[PDB]
């Protein structure tokens, strides 16, 4: 199903984008902990 083949690719693009949301959040979370730990010394 070559249409579904081009469909499937366009599907995976959304998964790849979904994860990119998720790790963006964790990146900032880690940066918040760093800022705290500096103030912890």
């Amino acid at each position: 199903e070559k249409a579904n083949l081009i469909t499937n690719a366009k599907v995976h693009i959304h998964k790849l984008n979904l994860v990119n949301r998720n790790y963006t959040k964790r990146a900032e979370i880690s940066r918040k902990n760093a800022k705290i730990a500096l103030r912890r010394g």
Partner: protein, 55 residues
């Protein structure tokens, strides 16, 4: 009859059933704190300064 009480108030069983309860108690109470885990998301996704103008 003292024998029949001592069979079933056996300190081998009193101490078992008392230890078992305590483990289940800490299992449940900590399973309530992870049931309130979402404050870590709320404090994270919203950091909005701009309303200091609105203030």
């Amino acid at each position: 009859e003292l024998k029949y009480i001592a069979t079933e108030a056996s300190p081998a069983k009193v101490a078992e059933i008392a230890e078992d309860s305590d483990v289940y108690v800490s299992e449940i109470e900590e399973a309530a704190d992870i049931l309130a885990g979402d404050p870590e998301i709320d404090l994270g996704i919203d950091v909005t300064d701009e309303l200091n103008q609105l203030e």
